[PDB]
Structure 1
Amino acid sequence: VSKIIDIKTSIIKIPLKRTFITAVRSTNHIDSLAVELTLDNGVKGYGVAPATTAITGDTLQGMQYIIREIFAPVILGSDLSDYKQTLELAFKKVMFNSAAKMAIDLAYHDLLAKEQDISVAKLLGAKANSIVTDVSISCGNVAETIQNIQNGVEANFTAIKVKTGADFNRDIQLLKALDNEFSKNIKFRFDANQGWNLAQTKQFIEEINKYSLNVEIIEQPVKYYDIKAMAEITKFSNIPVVADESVFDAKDAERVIDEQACNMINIKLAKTGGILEAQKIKKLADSAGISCMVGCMMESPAGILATASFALAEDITVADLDPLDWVAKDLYSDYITFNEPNIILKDNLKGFGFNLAENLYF
């Protein structure tokens, strides 16, 4: 019977290839916390999670304190086989801070898989090793945005996530330029990041329908708490509506199902607090006939690998996992081949297949 007898954490900062700009922040790096769990047979497991404070409220400093001072006393000395119960006991001591939970949940899965000498994807039941991602396009003026999209098409992507909601007039004009520059072989996914109101959303959908575009989803058009508007939009729309910030966890999923507020849920492990909770959402969505995609924060390739592993296990094929495009290939080439637009897991990995040598020990 294996027991967890040590926990360490380490902060990992990864430089980005270009500057990443959100509605509230600009950065040239990814902030992550890694956690290492050590079993009394010597097997070590790792989880890595981002500190995206504007979305999940996590900070590196908060996560470190939580893991060392709050989760560690619950985990330490406990049997690996009781992980479901251990995590439930640990997590009930902390409201929010979902990324700190993610790091812990992922390290546990890495241990479970390593104990069976298999990959985490295999542990979770995956057989396929490859998932398609869109490429993400930052907000910009119409011309810069058309060019960015072109460069994406040229790099082999055919699913294009277009960020909107900063300049509604730009969003509207953009659709005309889209209809003129691209064929229905290009599939568009718009993510307003809560930037539109109800009237704007309806209008944007109307403008789309004035053209001949291939648009597969409209993601989180309005504020995360406006479940009434989301439901009104879902009913109005002839295009799949995706809940992102409206759904972190399973009880959020229950509410959007109950209120019919989306057609599809965007699962991210940084919101769910890891794989166990993401599996609960996927089971609720299936029962409701609601589909799921997977997404991520701007986060390290380790988070992307864990998310891809979950998706492959859950028969989720729609994915927005393009942070691999923002970092150096050498950070992930030990476990992922990114032949755009395909994210392909390497063969015969034990657990996730990354180690934290350069961070923890070198």
Structure 2
Amino acid sequence: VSKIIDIKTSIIKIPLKRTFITAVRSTNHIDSLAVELTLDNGVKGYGVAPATTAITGDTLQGMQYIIREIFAPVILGSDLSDYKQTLELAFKKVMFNSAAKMAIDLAYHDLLAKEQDISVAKLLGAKANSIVTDVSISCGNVAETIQNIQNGVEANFTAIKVKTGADFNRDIQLLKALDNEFSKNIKFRFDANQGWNLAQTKQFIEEINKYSLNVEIIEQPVKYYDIKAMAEITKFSNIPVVADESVFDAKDAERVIDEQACNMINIKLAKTGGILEAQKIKKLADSAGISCMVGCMMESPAGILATASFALAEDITVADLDPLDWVAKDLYSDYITFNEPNIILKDNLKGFGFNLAENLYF
């Protein structure tokens, strides 16, 4: 039987086509750690995860140490077929650092798929190859935001993720401008990234209802830990409420289900620590009648591919996967065609379908 006999890691930095600015940070590149697992039959698997320290607490340096010194001793010499057990044993030695776990989990799935000579998407049960993404619009003044949205529509996106929560007055006034400039064929997804309080959230919802807008979701309006407010907003709202930072893992999902704190969960592999835990969330959500979407960090097209593979296998059609729009096409053109707004997996790939040759070998 196949055993994992080697583990390597590599830091990969990808340039962005434009400056990416968040509440805490500004950057021109993506930081990623890649891991390579080698079987004793020569087959190599790969996984790639972002270090988004502000969200998951991961750092490249921490991930590298965790994988080399903590996970590796558990993994080396183990049978591939025992992966579920090996991963449970390995991950229980580390609190948090979900992105480090993601990299390992993905590499394992790459191995499992390659051993069957299929794609990871196929391994996971996917049939369809294509998923629609929104385009993500950064915070800004009303004028430039309206323009950014217009560029998105002209680029063929009909689903628009509008970031809010930085300036509440701006968020409210934006609604008037949206109602004037756009019809109901454009659908909006707001993500406040924890920036609103309870009263503000209610106001924003009421304000939406004063206009005629197609608004699909209100995402993470309040602090990740204020589950009471999330439940109250979910009850108050006529628009589906999405838990993002409130849900990393299956036990977080259990809490928001128990407390009725959202209508939909935004699953991100960098939060879940990869595909196994993401599957557990989807299963819990299905049982509870809670819908799921998929999302990502500003991260490698490799992570996007893994996420799209998971969503296609899980019948998740709502996706915020835009980072492909931020990087050079030739980075992903071997495994993905992005014909906006469609992310389309290429045919006949083995495993995920990307290799690290340039980073690891050249």
Deviations 1:254-281 (A, max 9, x none): 0000000000000000000000000000
Shift of 1:49: 0.0
Deviations 1:317-354 (A, max 9, x none): 00000000000000000000000000000000000000
Shift of 1:25: 0.3
Shift of 1:80: 0.1
Q: Aligned to 2:103, what secondary structure does the other structure show?
A: helix
Q: Does 1:18 align with 2:18?
A: yes
Deviations 1:105-153 (A, max 9, x none): 0000000000000000000000000000000000000000000000000
Q: CA–CA distance in 1 between the matches of 2:108 and 2:141?
A: 44
Q: CA–CA distance in 1 between the matches of 2:325 and 2:191?
A: 18
Shift of 1:102: 0.0
Shift of 1:217: 0.1
Q: Aligned to 2:245, what secondary structure does the other structure show?
A: coil
Alignment of 1:1-362 (within 5 A): 1-362=1-362
Deviations 1:288-341 (A, max 9, x none): 000000000000000000000000000000000000000000000000000000
Shift of 1:287: 0.1
Q: CA–CA distance in 1 between the matches of 2:218 and 2:358?
A: 40
Q: CA–CA distance in 2 between the matches of 1:357 and 1:44?
A: 11
User: What is the RMSD of the two structures over their aligned residues, measured on CA atoms?
Assistant: 0.1
Shift of 1:13: 0.1
Q: CA–CA distance in 2 between the matches of 1:25 and 1:175?
A: 26
Identity %: 100
Unmatched 5+ stretches in structure 1: none
Q: CA–CA distance in 2 between the matches of 1:155 and 1:354?
A: 27
Q: CA–CA distance in 2 between the matches of 1:131 and 1:157?
A: 13
Q: CA–CA distance in 2 between the matches of 1:198 and 1:186?
A: 27
Shift of 1:45: 0.0
Shift of 1:54: 0.1
TM norm structure 1: 1.00
Q: Aligned to 1:131, what secondary structure does the other structure show?
A: strand
Q: CA–CA distance in 1 between the matches of 2:238 and 2:11?
A: 44
Deviations 1:158-210 (A, max 9, x none): 00000000000000000000000000000000000000000000000000000
Q: Aligned to 2:12, what secondary structure does the other structure show?
A: strand
TM norm structure 2: 1.00
Q: Which runs of 4+ in 1 moved over 4 A?
A: none
Shift of 1:231: 0.1
Q: Aligned to 1:74, what secondary structure does the other structure show?
A: helix
Q: Aligned to 2:305, what secondary structure does the other structure show?
A: helix
Q: CA–CA distance in 2 between the matches of 1:300 and 1:89?
A: 28
Shift of 1:58: 0.0
Q: CA–CA distance in 2 between the matches of 1:198 and 1:24?
A: 22
Q: CA–CA distance in 2 between the matches of 1:41 and 1:73?
A: 20
Shift of 1:40: 0.1
